[PDB]
């Protein structure tokens, strides 16, 4: 996002566990999402709370790219309909 | 009819079967012929109809072919693109 834009090919590995494998799309792809981190306030539970905080903060840095898709034929037909409408408005004026 | 050069007499041969022998005056000479072939519409009776069409295909076989049309969405896209091209021309001109 910020470095240059080269699309360094470091790929994420999701085939390790079934949990990551089945949540392939939600973690990244055509989905938008939220993380809900619960916390225990007891002083004895300090390290686990810090781990939860740090990984929630890391999860904040993640970008989602949800996009709506339909039949490309219908989308192209609608775009061409808008184009001919624009041209008709141009010549009618 | 095509080349003006009658093919000699191609002496037709009827003395081969009694049916064509008795009807020699009607097929040949100054005469006209017409044939009608019946066809049944059952999907079950396929090869009967196939044989009937095959044997009816003789006697001045007529050139046959198929057509096949295209995906309706593609035709609509092509028509829209042609209209857009005309209008762009309606704009250029």
From Swiss-Prot, chains A, B:
Domain of life: Eukaryota
Expression (tissue specificity): Expressed in neurons.
Coiled coil: 74-91
Places the protein is found: Cytoplasm, Cytoskeleton; Cell projection, Neuron projection; Cell projection, Axon; Cytoplasm, Perinuclear region
Domain notes: Composed of an N-terminal active core containing the motor domain (MD) and a neck coil (NC), a central regulatory center containing the FHA domain and coiled coils (CC1 and CC2) and required for dimerization and activation, and a cargo-recognition region containing a coiled coil (CC3), an undefined region (UDR) and the C-terminal PH domain.
Function recorded in the entry: Kinesin motor with a plus-end-directed microtubule motor activity. It is required for anterograde axonal transport of synaptic vesicle precursors. Also required for neuronal dense core vesicles (DCVs) transport to the dendritic spines and axons. The interaction calcium-dependent with CALM1 increases vesicle motility and interaction with the scaffolding proteins PPFIA2 and TANC2 recruits DCVs to synaptic sites.
Disease (UniProt): Spastic paraplegia 30A, autosomal dominant: A form of spastic paraplegia, a neurodegenerative disorder characterized by a slow, gradual, progressive weakness and spasticity of the lower limbs. Rate of progression and the severity of symptoms are quite variable. Initial symptoms may include difficulty with balance, weakness and stiffness in the legs, muscle spasms, and dragging the toes when walking. In some forms of the disorder, bladder symptoms (such as incontinence) may appear, or the weakness and stiffness may spread to other parts of the body. Spastic paraplegia 30B, autosomal recessive: A form of spastic paraplegia, a neurodegenerative disorder characterized by a slow, gradual, progressive weakness and spasticity of the lower limbs. Rate of progression and the severity of symptoms are quite variable. Initial symptoms may include difficulty with balance, weakness and stiffness in the legs, muscle spasms, and dragging the toes when walking. In some forms of the disorder, bladder symptoms (such as incontinence) may appear, or the weakness and stiffness may spread to other parts of the body.
Subunit structure: Dimeric motor; dimerization is required for ATP-driven processive motility. Monomer in vitro. Interacts with PPFIA1 and PPFIA4. Interacts with CALM1; the interaction is increased in presence of calcium and increases neuronal dense core vesicles motility. Interacts with PPFIA2 and TANC2; both interactions allow the recruitment of neuronal dense core vesicles to dendritic spines and decrease in presence of calcium. Interacts with SYT4 (unphosphorylated) and SYT11; both interactions increase in presence of calcium. Interacts with MADD.
Protein family: Belongs to the TRAFAC class myosin-kinesin ATPase superfamily. Kinesin family. Unc-104 subfamily.
Protein's UniProt name: Kinesin-like protein KIF1A
Gene name per UniProt: KIF1A
Location of this fragment in the whole protein: 293 to 385 of 1690
